[PDB]
């Protein structure tokens, strides 16, 4: 049951519902199986973010929510479902998605920053591993954060771990401003789960350097 | 190459090296590809932890490693390679396994308790999720930690999350005792991860209960 | 300028505001200076809680506030300012004190549990030391908290390190539930601060065995 | 009974010892009661850093004992007991300081960095709140380290959190670096205990911004 569309961006009531007292829908981003964000025109990415925080911010105004969820899985290790290029927004009748997440899992080291947006790391993470944060402080920077998540998510999938391949977008609409945390995905190694011995390097300075080089143009 | 066999549980030294100083070593479980840690039968289980210990052991009174790790990997989740049931022996000349990990990381929420062995849940977890602490004082209480292995095991693949298929076992000789820290490898949630909204319960005082079940026999 | 007043309990409107956009207030718990929480009696530490908590929840219905803390200040090391027993209730424009606290900050290993009230200590607590969570789910179990109140506080004041002299209360309307949170305060030891060399017992474990036996009456 | 003496510099056997298996010192560092780290000269603050790290790493050459801990506390949120400017030497028998400390709790947000020596605040403290890390990786840079170790004393005592009187200095030699960990301490806000309401500013890139203008000459 099609809920809107432009274009080849299709808002779907998702078919398959196995969340009780929630609203689920899905956003198919393309009419391709092989286009995803990193691959995306610029006039696409800027298409694609402006449909999807358009519908999920209006869908929040409905009296029947107490908050809607925005977020996007890609990749086998995201926890995702359909191959398709996707999201999802979920509305939710009784559970705040703000309630158990604090403003500091949103503050961090600055790789990028101007009047208009900001990105930096977590230093305090929700999970504990790498969390790229993207905040805007006004709605007519939003072309600002789909250019940021694009370039965010391209270097996750090219040189974060040597290729990714996994990572999820979650948005919040928190102290009147809308926030995109992208969080690579991928299976931690053993040697580090169980003893903390690294292969990679650890250190949130590296990760800023080589994220810097990706805005350098 | 043959280091070291006992009916069919064999240490190899790994062909397919890949870290710089450090001696790799793989040791098969069985001479077949169906059994595992939940099928095994209490004396090839105890065969295994025996013969997976002395040899573990007896590689760090070589002189040429500052320590030796011993661990396993099970379930496409956990960051294995091999389809057949094995664990790992690594030799490291300049890295000490317990450099990073601290004593806090072994205490936590007594499952089962006696003078011979201690089952926990930790408090204080290394990587943040469930890790169940299996604690020896004496080498003649091995026949013991493999049963509780065993049946960790038998509660992660079964119980735990309703089936959680990936696990690993790390092992430490730390202030004179043999530890087994079993950690159940699962894809997270992507809504906990980025909005901390469990699906099941997070209570460790629930997966106390329910661990304890196994251990009622 | 008085609010309320309830025999010795007095409700004063702070005189030195030094937070904006907030209404800072204070409850005198007694006419005398020598007498606090672990001497009370029965009767005057169920007439306390029950004052304080009823100022403190009608404040929150005046649509002048988004939300308002009821909280105390024990000892030379917990932030207070009068030698008076005294707590605080501080009316917020525009802050919500649960903004940045989660659910399984008040989850953790039982002490005490029943249908009508459940203590336990943080496993995952809001600043990483030892959190006491007193919880009741009906409004009608108010002298059942102030009596667990009252036990928790006459343990930290004399067994948790044997004696701790300062502690914090901090109460809480979470998901149609009343939580006291019990927060002892302490320099803490400087062999723990830069190495992680306690000088008690660090387990969880310890604590809820002798804090259960001030409930073994 | 005097162990080493440099002018007003005395190192003493403590004649109040409280901890079994151990080997306790004190370190006068001046023959007044008026100066401290902030107040002392450039010549000064390199004898008492050059004196106090000869005698900590000579004094771990000792067969006695596993390792040796030096260190400082100063003001009366420290845990330190004499009123007069002093650091302490204990050297333990049976216990390891770098057992439950690891690497990362040393890597952090950068303030200044060159081939001799790296200030930074740590991403991954130990205990949770603000660390600062100054690192030298040559025994040569002694006197660099000093001068680190005075100016972000200096800020402490002026700048962060408008004054804050009270400090801890922790040493530590670990993969052939010597590290001194500076940590603020501070009785915690009632409000950010509670509810993580806080009073300041809580980003790690402001406190960066502010101690590098202490560098500046
Ligand atoms: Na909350
Ligand atoms: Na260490
Ligand atoms: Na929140
Ligand atoms: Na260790
Ligand atoms: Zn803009
Ligand atoms: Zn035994
Ligand atoms: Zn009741
Ligand atoms: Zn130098």
């Not at 398959?16 to 007292?21: A, E, G």
């Not at 006039?43 to 925080?53: A, G, Q, V």
Request: hydrophobic letters at 40%; aromatic letters at 12%.
């Amino acid at each position: 049951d099609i809920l809107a569309t432009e274009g080849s961006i299709i808002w779907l009531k998702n078919k398959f519902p196995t969340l009780k007292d929630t609203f689920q829908t899905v956003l198919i981003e393309t009419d391709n199986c092989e286009d995803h964000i990193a691959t995306y025109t610029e006039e696409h990415m800027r298409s694609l973010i402006r449909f999807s925080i358009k519908h999920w911010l209006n869908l929040q105004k409905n009296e029947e929510f107490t908050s809607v969820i925005l977020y996007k899985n890609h990749g086998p290790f995201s926890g995702g479902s359909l191959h398709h290029a996707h999201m999802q927004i979920i509305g939710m009748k009784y559970v705040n998605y703000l309630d158990n997440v604090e403003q500091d899992n949103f503050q961090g080291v600055i790789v990028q920053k101007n009047e208009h947006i900001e990105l930096n790391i977590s230093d305090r993470p929700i999970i504990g591993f790498t969390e790229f944060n993207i905040i805007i402080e006004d709605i007519g920077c939003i072309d600002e954060l789909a250019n940021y998540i694009q370039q965010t998510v391209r270097y996750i999938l090219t040189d974060f771990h040597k290729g990714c391949s996994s990572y999820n977008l979650f948005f919040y609409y928190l102290n009147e401003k809308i926030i995109c945390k992208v969080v690579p995905r991928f299976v931690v190694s053993p040697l580090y789960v169980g003893y903390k011995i690294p292969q990679v390097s650890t250190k949130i300075e590296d990760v800023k350097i080589q994220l810097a080089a990706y805005f350098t143009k």
